[PDB]
Amino acid sequence: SVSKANVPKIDVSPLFGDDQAAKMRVAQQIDAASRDTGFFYAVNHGINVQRLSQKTKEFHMSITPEEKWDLAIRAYNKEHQDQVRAGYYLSIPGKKAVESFCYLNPNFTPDHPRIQAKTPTHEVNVWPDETKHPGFQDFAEQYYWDVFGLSSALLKGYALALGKEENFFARHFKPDDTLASVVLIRYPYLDPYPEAAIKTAADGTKLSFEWHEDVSLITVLYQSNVQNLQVETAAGYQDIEADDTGYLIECGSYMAHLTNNYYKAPIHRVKWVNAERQSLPFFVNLGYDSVIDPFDPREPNGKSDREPLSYGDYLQNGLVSLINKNGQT
Numbered sequence: 631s632v633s634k635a636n637v638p639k640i641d642v643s644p645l646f647g648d649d650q651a652a653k654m655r656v657a658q659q660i661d662a663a664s665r666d667t668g669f670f671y672a673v674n675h676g677i678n679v680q681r682l683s684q685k686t687k688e689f690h691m692s693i694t695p696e697e698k699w700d701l702a703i704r705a706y707n708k709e710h711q712d713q714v715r716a717g718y719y720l721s722i723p724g725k726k727a728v729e730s731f732c733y734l735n736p737n738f739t740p741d742h743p744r745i746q747a748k749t750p751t752h753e754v755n756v757w758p759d760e761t762k763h764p765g766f767q768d769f770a771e772q773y774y775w776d777v778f779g780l781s782s783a784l785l786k787g788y789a790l791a792l793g794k795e796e797n798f799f800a801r802h803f804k805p806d807d808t809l810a811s812v813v814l815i816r817y818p819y820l821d822p823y824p825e826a827a828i829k830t831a832a833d834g835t836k837l838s839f840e841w842h843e844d845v846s847l848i849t850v851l852y853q854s855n856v857q858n859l860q861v862e863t864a865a866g867y868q869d870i871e872a873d874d875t876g877y878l879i880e881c882g883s884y885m886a887h888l889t890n891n892y893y894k895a896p897i898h899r900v901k902w903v904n905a906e907r908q909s910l911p912f913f914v915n916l917g918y919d920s921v922i923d924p925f926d927p928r929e930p931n932g933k934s935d936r937e938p939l940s941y942g943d944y945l946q947n948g949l950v951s952l953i954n955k956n957g958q959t
């Protein structure tokens with residue numbers, strides 16, 4: 631028997647406005663969700679997610695094998711030693727069904743001081759040929775800033791929920807330095823679906839991606855309408871309902887660190903489902919040198935002995951560890 635998680639729908643539209651009490655009522659809902667199973671759906675978010683899905687499908691369904699090698703990250707193409715994060719992540723027919731394309735802050739150019747300094751986790755995005763993929767780069771860059779805007783407002787809700795002033799997180803989330811990323815993931819329909827691409831959980835469930843916590847402050851996720859996610863609870867894994875009109879929001883492990891686990895990073899996994907679908911996360915990451923002072927809203931004095939953690943080190947370590955534990959995607 632598999633139960634179903636309570637995933638509240640939260641109208642986040644007040645977070646874009648100037649009605650402070652309405653913002654507090656959104657914040658209370660974020661607090662309640664974050665203290666329960668974590669996840670909530672942000673609704674009334676203002677982003678055209680139908681166009682996001684359409685433009686993403688057009689890219690996934692038209693990119694050629696040649697273009698995939700030309701854009702491939704270093705894990706697939708030794709010529710591309712600078713691509714640890716950004717680029718194409720290839721499928722392996724018979725072995726690995728998922729494939730994806732990751733891009734970073736469009737302001738990371740050769741002019742940017744973090745690129746000049748060669749700081750880890752900063753890379754210049756790679757893109758397919760414009761004439762072969764008309765409008766794709768422009769769509770993808772616009773989307774980065776659209777979802778940046780939503781995420782900034784969500785971060786105001788999380789700050790208010792934790793008893794802070796509304797810019798407590800968002801002040802560290804800036805277009806000039808954010809390490810945030812978009813990933814356009816394709817999960818294919820395959821007939822036959824190769825068993826080598828399916829993992830078996832300890833509890834017997836067939837999975838496409840094993841349990842993990844997110845490497846993020848928060849994660850702002852669109853998925854097409856195919857149920858697949860499960861969240862761990864003390865009584866076992868519970869199904870998260872799909873909703874292709876909203877964004878599924880959760881805390882990542884940086885939030886758990888800074889709140890002394892008051893808002894935990896929910897453990898979750900991806901069930902195997904033989905269906906063509908999309909998983910389009912935006913990982914809300916701060917800047918490389920961003921440090922948030924930890925606190926514990928359970929203590930009267932709010933004091934935490936947890937050490938302040940630099941975001942860039944957290945991200946570097948976290949992305950490597952996730953690959954080591956859950957496989958190169």
Ligand SMILES: CC(C)[C@@H](NC(=O)[C@H](CS)NC(=O)CCC[C@H](N)C(=O)O)C(=O)O
Pocket residue numbers: 714715716732810811813815839842843844845851900909911913949952959
């Ligand atoms: C759980 C979903 C969000 C999705 N999984 C994922 O996105 C998984 C787990 S959160 N995330 C990752 O692999 C980290 C990608 C980091 C990215 N290359 C970057 O450099 O920033 C899936 O559908 O498999």
Ligand SMILES: [Fe+3]
Pocket residue numbers: 842843844898
């Ligand atoms: Fe995740």
